[PDB]
Amino acid sequence: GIFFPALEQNMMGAVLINENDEVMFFNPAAEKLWGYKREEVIGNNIDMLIPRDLRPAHPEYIRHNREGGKARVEGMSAELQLEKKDGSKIWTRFALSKVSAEGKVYYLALVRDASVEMAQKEQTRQLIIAVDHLDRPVIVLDPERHIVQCNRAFTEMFGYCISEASGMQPDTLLNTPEFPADNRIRLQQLLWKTARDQDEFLLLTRTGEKIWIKASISPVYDVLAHLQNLVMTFSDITEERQIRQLEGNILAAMCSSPPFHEMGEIICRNIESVLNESHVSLFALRNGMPIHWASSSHGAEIQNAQSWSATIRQRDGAPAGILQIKTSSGAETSAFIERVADISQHMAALALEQEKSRQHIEQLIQFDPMTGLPNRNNLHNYLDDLVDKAVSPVVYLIGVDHIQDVIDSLGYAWADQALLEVVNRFREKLKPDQYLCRIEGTQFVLVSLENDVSNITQIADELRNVVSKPIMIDDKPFPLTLSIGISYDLGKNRDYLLSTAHNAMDYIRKNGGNGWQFFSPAMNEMVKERLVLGAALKEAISNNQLKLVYQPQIFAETGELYGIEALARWHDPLHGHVPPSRFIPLAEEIGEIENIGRWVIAEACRQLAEWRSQNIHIPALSVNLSALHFRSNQLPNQVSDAMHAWGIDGHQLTVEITESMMMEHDTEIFKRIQILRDMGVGLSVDDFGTGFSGLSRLVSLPVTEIKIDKSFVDRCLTEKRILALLEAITSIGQSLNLTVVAEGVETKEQFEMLRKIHCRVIQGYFFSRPLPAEEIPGWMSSVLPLK
Amino acid sequence: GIFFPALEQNMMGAVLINENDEVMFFNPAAEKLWGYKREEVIGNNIDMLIPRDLRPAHPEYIRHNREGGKARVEGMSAELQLEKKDGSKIWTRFALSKVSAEGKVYYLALVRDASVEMAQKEQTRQLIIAVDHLDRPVIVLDPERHIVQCNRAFTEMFGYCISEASGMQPDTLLNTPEFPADNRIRLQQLLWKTARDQDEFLLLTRTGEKIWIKASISPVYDVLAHLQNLVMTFSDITEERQIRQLEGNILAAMCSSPPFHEMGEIICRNIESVLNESHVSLFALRNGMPIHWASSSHGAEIQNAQSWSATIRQRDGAPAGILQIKTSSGAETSAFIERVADISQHMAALALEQEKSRQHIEQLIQFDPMTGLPNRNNLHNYLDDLVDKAVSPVVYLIGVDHIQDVIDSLGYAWADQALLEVVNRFREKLKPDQYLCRIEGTQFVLVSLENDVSNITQIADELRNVVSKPIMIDDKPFPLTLSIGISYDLGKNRDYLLSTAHNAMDYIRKNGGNGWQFFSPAMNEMVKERLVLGAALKEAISNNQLKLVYQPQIFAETGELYGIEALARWHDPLHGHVPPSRFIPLAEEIGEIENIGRWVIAEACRQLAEWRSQNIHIPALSVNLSALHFRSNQLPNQVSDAMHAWGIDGHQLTVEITESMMMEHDTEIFKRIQILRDMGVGLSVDDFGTGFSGLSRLVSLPVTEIKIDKSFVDRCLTEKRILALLEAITSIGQSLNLTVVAEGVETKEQFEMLRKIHCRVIQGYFFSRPLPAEEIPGWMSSVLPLK
Ligand code: HEM
Numbered sequence A, B: 001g002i003f004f005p006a007l008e009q010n011m012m013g014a015v016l017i018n019e020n021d022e023v024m025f026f027n028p029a030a031e032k033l034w035g036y037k038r039e040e041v042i043g044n045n046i047d048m049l050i051p052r053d054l055r056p057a058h059p060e061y062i063r064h065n066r067e068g069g070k071a072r073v074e075g076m077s078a079e080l081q082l083e084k085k086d087g088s089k090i091w092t093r094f095a096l097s098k099v100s101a102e103g104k105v106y107y108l109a110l111v112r113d114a115s116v117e118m119a120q121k122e123q124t125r126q127l128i129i130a131v132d133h134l135d136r137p138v139i140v141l142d143p144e145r146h147i148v149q150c151n152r153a154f155t156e157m158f159g160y161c162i163s164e165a166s167g168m169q170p171d172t173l174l175n176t177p178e179f180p181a182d183n184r185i186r187l188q189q190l191l192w193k194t195a196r197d198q199d200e201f202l203l204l205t206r207t208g209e210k211i212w213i214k215a216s217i218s219p220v221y222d223v224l225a226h227l228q229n230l231v232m233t234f235s236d237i238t239e240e241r242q243i244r245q246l247e248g249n250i251l252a253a254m255c256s257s258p259p260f261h262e263m264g265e266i267i268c269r270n271i272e273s274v275l276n277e278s279h280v281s282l283f284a285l286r287n288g289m290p291i292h293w294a295s296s297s298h299g300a301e302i303q304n305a306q307s308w309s310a311t312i313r314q315r316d317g318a319p320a321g322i323l324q325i326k327t328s329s330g331a332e333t334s335a336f337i338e339r340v341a342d343i344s345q346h347m348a349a350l351a352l353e354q355e356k357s358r359q360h361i362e363q364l365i366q367f368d369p370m371t372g373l374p375n376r377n378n379l380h381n382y383l384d385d386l387v388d389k390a391v392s393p394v395v396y397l398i399g400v401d402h403i404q405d406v407i408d409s410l411g412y413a414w415a416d417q418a419l420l421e422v423v424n425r426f427r428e429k430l431k432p433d434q435y436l437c438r439i440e441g442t443q444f445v446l447v448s449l450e451n452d453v454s455n456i457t458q459i460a461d462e463l464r465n466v467v468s469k470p471i472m473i474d475d476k477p478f479p480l481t482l483s484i485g486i487s488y489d490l491g492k493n494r495d496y497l498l499s500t501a502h503n504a505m506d507y508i509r510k511n512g513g514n515g516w517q518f519f520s521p522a523m524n525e526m527v528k529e530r531l532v533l534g535a536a537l538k539e540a541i542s543n544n545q546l547k548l549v550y551q552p553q554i555f556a557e558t559g560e561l562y563g564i565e566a567l568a569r570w571h572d573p574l575h576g577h578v579p580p581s582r583f584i585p586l587a588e589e590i591g592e593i594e595n596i597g598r599w600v601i602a603e604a605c606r607q608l609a610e611w612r613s614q615n616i617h618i619p620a621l622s623v624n625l626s627a628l629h630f631r632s633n634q635l636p637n638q639v640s641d642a643m644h645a646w647g648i649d650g651h652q653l654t655v656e657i658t659e660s661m662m663m664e665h666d667t668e669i670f671k672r673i674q675i676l677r678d679m680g681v682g683l684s685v686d687d688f689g690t691g692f693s694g695l696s697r698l699v700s701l702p703v704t705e706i707k708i709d710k711s712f713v714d715r716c717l718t719e720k721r722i723l724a725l726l727e728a729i730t731s732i733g734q735s736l737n738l739t740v741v742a743e744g745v746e747t748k749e750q751f752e753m754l755r756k757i758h759c760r761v762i763q764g765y766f767f768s769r770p771l772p773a774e775e776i777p778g779w780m781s782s783v784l785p786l787k
């Protein structure tokens, strides 16, 4: 065969197999392709030329091809994996033909290597993937000036797919606006060949809208300087404007320090505003576990939705949260979603940092730039120390009401001023034993140690009253008010007391505010009982049903009555006998004490008047004004007019003054009681004033009696220490010519001691207990003397 | 021949040329490839099929090859363009061989249409331009994460080229810099994830520079849903991270809201830190003008300055300010400078919104919201109120300095906390009649009504040392200091009492952190004069420059001496003859009262010892020990040791005491005096006690002698009632030998008035001025008695 050397000297592998599939030819080209020697294959079966994984199957194909009867070969059209002798595989192609000669069918295969072809194919595939993941549209144009290569970004921006956009001129078939933006002319003026110049144009998409595009252009020449190719990089402008707006809005909102769940909503709503028709959400990693933070209002699902999941990480370290966004596919481009994701992530990180720093500040700071007062972070550390020492404080929970009116009408700036003015009132009226704090917002706490009802009611009433004068804020009155609750118990943890006080606050505010209450009912009905007692006292003093008793005072030596004293008494069927030591404080706290004094003065004068009219006379009655808390500006008028109403007998009436009530206060009364003194009223004292000035005002005010009170005469028996000052008092009286009376004597030893010390007049249980006006005349007529 | 008919049915193009170039081996595939028919080719020279450019050379090439005798065929490897019979052009690949048959040498050429491969070649050539133009580093990774593709941006950024960075790991080439914190694991995690993700890494370039980059990884899947490739995109974020640092710092400041002129400085400082060799200026709009807010002080030389002027606008959109930037040519990019301008203009926008809100109410609100204290308007009102009442106050201008320490160590919130702590100290030490306000920043004003320089100095010193303990916040100590300026007049302008105070404050602040000053012309030097007198008093009390002085006492009932008194006297020529009224309160203030206290009695004991050497008998001697302001800390020990210091009997020395010092503490003073009273030293007293004459009678027997102060005897012509006081004394005196000492006699009309009422002892100027030390050993010997 003359054509056999033609096959032999070729560079393409030649294989010839017969009807029996025995290989008849195997050139060095096939040798180098398969790694085999020609002797191994000449005259042998086609089996070894088949790869092992296909060897059981290929001979079936071989016999099927023979039995098919087709006159053409359709197999081996595509690439095939050729495994050589060592076991390594390559890509090869075949040009097999079917030959029928000498009454037998033969196969003549020419084998070529496609290694470089497959390598270039994979290269092109990886390149198209890279070009797709490029975040900016790219078009390659030629001197034929048709869109040759497209991009995924270009497809997603302008809607022209690869096949459609292929083979069309860019600046003529891409639809123009209806205006004079002559894209092709702009490109062809002086720019096409050499100018890397940019300009703004408008383009039309598949949806229908027209968008602004930058169309940066650049040519590429080969070595021969001929114009080889060209690149156009379309870039959007609405996207960049919206991204800048998103940054500005997020920073503008965040700089005002909103609450955490408001900042989350701000981020969500802004991401939505940039990308309409989407559902966004935020989770924060607390203790390694996500927690929901915010979401869009429209919680319904989105058809054909796609999700972008971004990890919110702080300035250094572990993730702090997870943002996720879902939006309908084909709505906005992938690069634009990615930009919004990056901006939102890098702002949520700052939100987390601010919240963390805020929590760190909250767990520490004690004072407050607003209100200038300690906040609860100091109240905790102070009240725990108080309660640790086993002393039981009294906690006042104060809540100012009706602040929203100012908050609305004039705003938060002036609401702060109103609250600051109230704080100033509290500061000006507090006391050194008290502690003031503000817990949250418009709720305050006052810690006191005056643990008794009498002080508690007084201080609570004063706190409630501090707001009697309306808060003035820029020439507009505002009548604020307070709801104040009291808590007090021993040994209980501060949670108990705080809870009780807050319960009282809630009760009073629900009832209507403007008031004060106790928690424990056992501590609460006492106020009601005292109010009932005060009402009873007021009604009785109005109705003139009080009583007077007459202590007798007798010379220790001669035995005659030196005088008597008027002692207030108070008996009521609904309450029983109540002593003055209890119900004079009640009169002082109710504000009816002036009328009590009026009654005692008038009744004593009248009761002396009946006896003086009768055939009996007594030296004087002492009416204990300062003991009855007579101290007021209107002292002399009543004493004078009551005396005038029954007769001019000034030498028979005497008034008592307590310890330093005439000097420290009531100067205008000390400067006027001289009128009574000149009228004829006597004067008696209990304690001497400040040294060299309280000496009966340098005996100016002609005091006549000193009353050694019971507190000393009860202990005179057991203390020569007190006996010494008793002797001094007696000597001072004797020297100054003052008379000395003793109060509260009971025993004969005490009387003898007073006699030897030379006490001039003695009163008490030893001689005669205080007795009524109906029994004083008989006793004074019958019994004389008691020495 | 059957190989020609075999390849007739083959897809391989084939041509064979003989000696005469007449083709006898040509197939329908070749007919399709070229266009000439078999009848037109067979027996015809091939030269008709050759492009015309090889007409004079093709046969010449055949002859040259034949003459050279190339045994092995290696030509026609390169792909060649071809022109068909109809003029169409394609690309073909040849395969040549040499054929020897019929005693002649023939040439075989197989031909294939290389269009299906040159399509891929022109595909990848065009795709490379697209993948390389945009300057964005993208890489493609296999399933095992080996890198397979890279582009121009990647090689120009990270140094490595494709050949070096082809077929290996994508992190070994991206090894982290020397900072080993977290990037070493962050890479290994991101690069091995299996979902879309992105992080920021510190990476070291091949040449050794440091780049902060943002890396994103995303997978691409084939049809069979298997993981096919991983594309990774990097991006340089150095400028972005600088902008993020700016944003973080400005948020960290504006969440605390420092003063306006400091927020401006913060913005400008960060601008200079983010921009290179630039200038920044910010202007607000007041009444329609550009008013300067703050500008960077970095006035470095700028070459070819580029200017930008953005109009920061309010919420309503009206222009409100100008953010003007000057940049060097080529220092920063247009996009960078525009972005920085936009960020800073939003920050400045919110700052100006705050400032415009604040400015509306600054002249109306009375209180100061930063600390709850009154504001400058309130001080204006207070000073107006005082000047209307014609009372000139003191205006201490407190300046809290070294606040900058907390400013640059922790920040503005902690600076406010420190201010709160200092004002809490101020209020806890504040007195009831002291007015306090905060004018601006860290400047407070304290207005009072004192006028004695000792009191003023005391207030200033207590204000200075109320901060002596450093403000402990988070256990970190900060030694704040204070500057104080004082202003006085008989009344001066309401704002001038602040400007003048600020003169002193500025003087002290510039010339030393901690201290205080009056005004130089009059009394800032007087303070120093008093301090010099204090140093002189220290010197004199150390070196016994003082001298005791003596003044006799004579029985009123004609008789001899009762006692000799002691008084401290001082005389230094440099300072003159300072009197007791001047140097005793100074002695207390300076802190050396104990020295004079012990000296006055040590000299007393020694002097009695010396006088005893002769016929001098010393009926009594009285050191004062009461006007010297003794404390209870060391009262008894010194007076006790003075006795045994020279062996003096306790029945001639005496002690005078005052109730004010006696009742400082009701526990220890009288207990200390008990030891002395047991010793036998007399206890005189002054103006009477307050405890109902008790301890004046029993605990210490201080009525051994009781005195009459100077202020009563001279005025005795008005208080004639003092006869009662003297009779009161004389009662107990005739009881148990108790004397009274009248003092301050000048003339006979007063002497006879004081003597007509029985007073034992008379002493004063009427008898003798205080004799110097040495005269008594003659005076006593001479005058006995005086009658
Ligand atoms: C690496 C070695 C081989 C591989 C990968 C292989 C695989 C294949 C496959 C899958 C086809 C059919 C393609 C299609 O239907 O689209 C084919 C075609 C064919 N190849 Fe093979 N085979 C191999 C070995 C051989 C050998 C050594 C011969 C020797 C003559 C041969 C002769 C044929 C025949 C007769 C057909 C049928 C063509 C037709 O029916 O149109 N094969 N080959």
Ligand code: HEM
Pocket: B015, B017, B050, B051, B054, B061, B062, B065, B070, B073, B074, B075, B076, B077, B078, B080, B081, B082, B096, B107, B108, B109
């Ligand atoms: C468009 C058609 C053709 C062109 C442009 C062309 C051109 C060339 C060129 C440039 C060479 C030398 C470099 C190289 O071989 O790569 C060459 C070699 C050669 N060509 Fe062609 N040729 C064409 C067609 C043919 C055909 C159909 C034959 C048929 C036998 C042929 C026969 C040869 C021979 C014998 C050599 C010598 C190779 C050697 O000595 O190594 N040429 N041709």
